[PDB]
Design a protein around this nucleic acid. Structure first.
Lengths: 79, 75, 79, 77, 78, 75
DNA sequence: TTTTTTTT
DNA sequence: TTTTTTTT
DNA sequence: TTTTTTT
C-alpha cells in the first residue's frame, strides 16, 4: 500500500529493501526504483537503483503488456 | 520489440535506457538500465526479480493516480 | 556445525545448496531456511526460501515431536 | 495439530504461516509455507519444501541454533 | 568417455548411474552417483558417494581382491 | 577383514569401506561410509550390481588417465 | 559499469 | 500463488 | 566511523 516518507514523498515497497517512489527535483517529477539501506532505524536510498523521468516511466508502462506475456510463456503467474 | 546481442528482448524507454528480460542461471530478471556504447550496460539501473516486478505492477494504478494529481497525463 | 558467513552470521548446511542461518534485519533476529547459489566464489542466499521470526521458530519447535511421530509411521528413521 | 483440505496435517506457526507434511510423487515433504485466504486456505509463493533427509539434517542443527538464539537473548525451551 | 554440462568428464555404468570427476574447493572428487532427468539434462541426485583421490586409490588397491571373491561366487570378470 | 554380517571389506579410509554383500539373492559391491556403534553403515554411499561394477572396471583406465593429467599420482 | 535472505 | 536431488 | 535517490 501507498506509504509516505518525511518529505511527504509517496512510496510503495516491492521487497524488504526495495521501493518505488515519487520525488520532485529541479521542478520535475521522478519515479525511483531503488534499494534502501537502514540508517538509524530509518530507510535511506542507496546506490543501486534508477530514477525515471515521467516520460521514461510512461514508455515503460507501454512495454508492460509485452513483458507480461513473455514472462507467462516462461511459466510465471502474472496477474 | 527489439532483440539484443545476447538474444534477450528489450524495449527502449530513452536514447540510452532499456527495459529487458534476461535469464541468469535459469532465473528471470526484469532489467531497467542505462546503456553506453561499446551498447553495454552501465551503472544506473536495477535487476528486478519476478516477485518484485509483480509487486511493482500492483502498485501501478496508485502511482499513476499520484502522478495524475501532480498534473501528468497517464492513460 | 556452526559455520560463519561473510558478514558474521552463523549458518548450518543441511544440503549442498540449502542452509539454515541466523541474521538481523530491522534490528530483529530471523531464522532463514533458504537455498543458496554459487557466484564468483562464495555461496549467496537465493530467492527460494522462508525467513522466520523467533516466535515463528519456537512455534515450529513445539511442532517437532508430532512431526517426527508422523514421519516414523511412514517408515522414516528419526533420531 | 490440524488437517488441511488435501487431508494433510499442519501445525500453525503464525496467523498466515504453516508447517505441514505432504505426499507428492510418493515422497514425503516437510513444508514451511505462507498461506492466503480464498473462500478456503491456499499455499503461497513464500516457502520451502524439505526432503526428510534435509529435515533430519535440520533436527541435527537445532541444538546449535538454539544455543545461538539464547546467546542473543531469546528465551528458548 | 564423455563430458557433462558443467564441463567435467564422466562414464556411464548403468541407465541412470555415472562415474564422474569434478573439482570442488580445489580438490578432485570421483563421484559414483545416481542422476535424474529434470530439464532434459541429467543432474546428480541424492544417492551416491564422492571419493577423494586417496580413497579412490585405496579402492583400486582392493580391486584384485574384490574380483577374486566375485569370481569364486561365479561371476565373470575381465 | 570381516564385518558383523560375515561379509568381507576393505578400508579405503578411516570411516569408509569397500565391501561385498549378498541381499535378496544378488551380489553387491558396496562403497559406503560407516559410523561408530560395532561399526554400522551410514546413509551416504552406493551399492553396485556386479554389472555396474564391471562397467566401472572398464572406465578405470580412462579415469586414471584424466586424474593423472590433473597431476595426481596413480600407479 | 547487470542479474536472487529477513514478519505482523 | 507448493511439494527434492553431487563433491572428504 | 565505516559507500549509498532523482535525465
Amino acid at each position: 500500500g501507498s506509504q509516505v516518507d518525511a518529505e511527504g514523498n509517496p512510496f510503495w515497497e516491492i521487497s524488504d529493501k526495495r521501493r518505488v517512489g515519487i520525488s520532485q527535483f529541479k521542478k520535475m517529477d521522478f519515479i525511483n526504483i531503488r534499494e534502501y539501506y537502514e540508517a538509524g532505524g530509518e530507510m535511506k536510498p542507496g546506490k543501486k537503483g534508477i530514477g525515471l523521468t515521467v516520460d521514461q516511466y510512461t514508455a515503460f508502462l507501454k512495454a508492460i503488456p509485452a513483458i507480461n506475456a513473455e514472462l507467462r510463456s516462461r511459466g510465471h503467474d502474472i496477474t
